[PDB]
């Protein structure tokens, strides 16, 4: 039984950042070389773990989070980082043990005139905790009253920093329990 990595990476539709998706991988063999040696990714940085040693490690759970953000927002998907995405949409903790993988999706997630299906959270009273999700819609708009979510300007003719990127984050969990996922 092989882990359904392709089912996550080769998906037709990704979730917006404020409402990021999560799936749990367990009870399977995890071949990570299919991701590490892939030329389709622009980003593949691991924290707390070496990307070439993954096939020799066993975990109790592997969690795959996915969302779409701008190119210039990719740097905020990391430990110790701050910003509108890091603080109000998707927060990672200081002692993360996982890998962040991202690639350009300009030819999938944009259209002439701009694709505004994806939106990001702009206003919040406070910052998010690690792996917290907030999809509330609380502000009538008016003077000093604003909608919490702001649409993205994903146009196909935008510069690289403003193009859409698909991001998948693989978090590695080790409990006081027998591992369920091992490499070859």
């Amino acid at each position, epitope marked *: 039984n*092989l882990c359904p990595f*392709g089912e996550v990476f*080769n*998906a037709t539709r990704f979730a917006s950042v404020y409402a990021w998706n999560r799936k749990r991988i367990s009870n399977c063999v995890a071949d990570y070389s299919v991701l590490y040696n892939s030329a389709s990714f622009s980003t593949f940085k691991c924290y707390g773990v070496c990307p070439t040693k993954l096939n020799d490690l066993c975990f109790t759970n592997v969690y795959a989070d996915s969302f779409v953000i701008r190119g210039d927002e990719v740097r905020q998907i990391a430990p110790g980082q701050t910003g509108k995405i890091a603080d109000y949409n998707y927060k990672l903790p200081d002692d993360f043990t996982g890998c962040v993988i991202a690639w350009n999706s300009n*030819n*999938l997630d944009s*259209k002439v005139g701009g694709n505004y299906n994806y939106q990001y959270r702009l206003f919040r009273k406070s910052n998010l905790k690690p792996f917290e999700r907030d999809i509330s819609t609380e502000i009538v708009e008016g003077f000093n009253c604003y909608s919490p979510l702001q649409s993205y300007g994903f146009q196909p003719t935008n510069g690289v920093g403003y193009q859409p990127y698909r991001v998948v984050v693989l978090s590695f969990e080790l409990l006081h329990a027998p591992a369920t996922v091992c490499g070859p």
Partner: antibody
Amino acid sequence: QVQLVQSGAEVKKPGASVKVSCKASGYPFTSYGISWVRQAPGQGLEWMGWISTYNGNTNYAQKFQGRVTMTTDTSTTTGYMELRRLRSDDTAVYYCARDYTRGAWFGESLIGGFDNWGQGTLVTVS
Amino acid sequence: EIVLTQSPGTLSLSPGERATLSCRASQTVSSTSLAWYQQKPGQAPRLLIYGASSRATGIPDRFSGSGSGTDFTLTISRLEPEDFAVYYCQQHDTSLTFGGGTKVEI
């Protein structure tokens, strides 16, 4: 390499059922779903349904609802489809193929198509 | 469900000539859900292009395609004796359906 193998031609009476097998090898069985498509003489490709080899979940075309049952046998890595209440309009060649349009575990939509098609099984109703 | 119509019905072309096959959807179809198939007489259908721009393993580089919105195209840069077959467009954005199919013959 990957190959899907089906049974030979069958002849059934009206009202009868037909069970068509599809033996699949050359890949991890539980990693890919199985799709079924039929082609009547002079016609194009008509989708009947889809089954996952991981959790047994199915998805059928409305046209065939209530008449088609799908199952899998992991130990022999073989899929099966049964078409019940055969009519004169059900004379066709029934094909199996390896699916990558729907996820086997979660049922998500994927970027892909049907491949490694079998030779097709001809079923005649008379 | 989304209806797929292909045109022209039948193409009459010599070997060595270029061919273009069109498929128009009644509804918008994402490129991620659009694929093309080829069927030779007496044989099962084969996947040529998946995702509307990516070709299946074993498919010659003379086969390509692209599209957006409701208009997708399959292009054969040069017709070989082995390229004369019935081609189909398929979508799985809503349920799963196939188009009528287009025949290319000498």
